[PDB]
Symmetry: C3
Subunit: 251 residues, 3 copies
């Protein structure tokens, strides 16, 4: 299987299993990722997903051999796996080695990035006379300073993970080989919080980028009201009062 | 009094005076803050305000006890004091200790933040099954890198002031206990500049976020014309020519 | 000549030649810059431009003496040289010494900034009772953290290049006196990539700021299709396959 899926408590671990091809995205991998996100969002037993690449490399981008023969790597309505339709639940990318071109675009479509100190990002498409069309040009300038995003886009240069951490692209710098365990620790903190409040918090942040300051509080209030009337909200207050862990139901 | 107000030259010092409750915002504090901003903006003898919390702690958020009994902490049209209606004159937050939840949202509604090296920010609402609705989810992603804002929102973790300074959230790192004096020095630099030009500069920056590149220069020009025809503009030129301090009138 | 223009391979070097006036922009310099950009964009033999100031100083802003006598420094439809109409090809600013007021606004209207370790930026207009109207208030908050942009705007303080590099404003920190050579190295990396893909990458990044997430991929696709059907795209693939340098034609 070109994409491996493992359930661990409330956490879905998604592993691109194409290491001899540096985990490049073909049609198989693209469909596997989309299915994995449909599983994450559709299963009430899951809170967070982690995306990683096996064997020490995250993702070299779209498979060039598969692009050559004309495979349908881009699935209409999802893009490269999920670049044009990110999941509603939180997604963490855990990055070893190279995440280049489509690979950096997979990481950008996640919410959070955990990267080994020796890993690298980049969008080298222009070096081949191409353009990064998986959302890298639309998200990188919103994730790191605009001029740096512009530089990486125009040169195709690598962005080493230490610099990406300094620029705010990488949330956690991990020791080489341990990115996945650092992402699990981050995912376990997110799963310990209120499922409805977590999904509503991300929804407000992502959908507010297409809102207007005119109407930002009004729009946000519609998302807030179901969380504040939720059973979990009452359980949260009782558990904090009794100095114990809350037992979420997702209602 | 739950909010203390002091006039020092052209600077208004606003102190939340509820230290045994960690300066949490009840109805009293919320109304006091709104009044303080109305005083700042309405008094021609004032240029800048500083918001701080007494006793070594900025603000623990909305008072939970007051939220429990149903106090009207949120005043319609202002939010938590002023989160939904920031003042037109510059506001500096000086942060000792913890600024959490609503407290971080008060700081975000200011223009500038001075923070002690040992202070911390955070929005831990999701840990209780709630969501930060005082503007934290709408401003933090515009103040620090998007992924970091997302991480703090999803985990509820603390953001230590040193990191917040590295991320651009904190303007000045102060020695512990001295945040207020560092904020005064920053406020005194702002008050030395042209009052109309200062108020117009902030107005252009804040209102440009809801403008369109199509019409950005046109909109900005309408704000520029009164400042450039102002008496202060002529006084600014004369004083620089004569190598002396300008005497602003605010006209 | 108050603006010097030199062609070196595919790189246009634009030097403000007014060093006794600290390279301040008068009507002459403003028209020279606009002409230089028309040359860059109109000549198919050029890929990238560098803007610098001769003698160790980038640009002190608009010439005050020329503003005093009423020269038309701002040319309608271009602003200060090009602040209101940046070129379509990539522009790099190489900064020695001071880049203040209009000077920082010239640098902001570029795509990339190379700055000597001992150089400084700033917008001190408010210190004279004026406002920075050359785009500094509209671009700085999109280039460095919002609160820092706000601080520099309200105080007029200098932003030293080392800090500007930490904040993401400066792409490359250069040794003092060597900014121009560092900018050439950066320009040479950009010129080695596909001309159409480079111009299309910048166009997507700049025009996406005025797009909506609703329609962002649709808008981007219209720019992508000519690059992907281009002769250069095929040459890029052949050259990478044969492990040799691609010979771009710009078609």
């Amino acid at each position: 299987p070109e994409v491996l899926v493992e359930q661990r408590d409330r956490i879905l671990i998604i592993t691109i299993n194409r290491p001899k091809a540096k985990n490049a995205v073909n049609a198989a991998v693209s469909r596997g990722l989309a299915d994995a996100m449909d599983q994450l969002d559709g299963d009430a037993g899951l809170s967070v997903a982690i995306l990683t690449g096996g064997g020490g490399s995250f993702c070299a981008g779209m498979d060039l051999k598969a692009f050559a023969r004309g495979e349908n790597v881009v699935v209409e309505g999802r893009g490269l796996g999920f670049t044009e339709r990110p999941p509603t639940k939180p997604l963490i990318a855990a990055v070893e080695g190279y995440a280049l071109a489509g690979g950096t675009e997979l990481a950008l479509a996640a919410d959070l990035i955990v990267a080994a100190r020796d890993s690298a990002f980049g969008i080298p498409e222009v070096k081949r006379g191409l353009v990064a069309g998986g959302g890298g040009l639309l998200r990188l300038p919103e994730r790191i300073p605009y001029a740096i995003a512009m530089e990486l886009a125009l040169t195709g240069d690598n962005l080493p993970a230490e610099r990406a951490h300094e620029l705010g692209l990488v949330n956690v710098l991990a020791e080489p080989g341990t990115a996945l365990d650092a992402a699990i620790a981050l995912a376990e903190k997110i799963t310990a919080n209120g499922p409805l409040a977590v999904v509503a918090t991300k929804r407000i942040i992502t959908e507010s980028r297409g809102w207007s300051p005119d109407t930002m509080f009004a729009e946000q209030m519609k998302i807030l009201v179901p969380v504040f009337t939720s059973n979990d909200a009452k359980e949260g207050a009782i558990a904090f009062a009794e100095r114990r862990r809350p037992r979420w139901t997702g209602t």
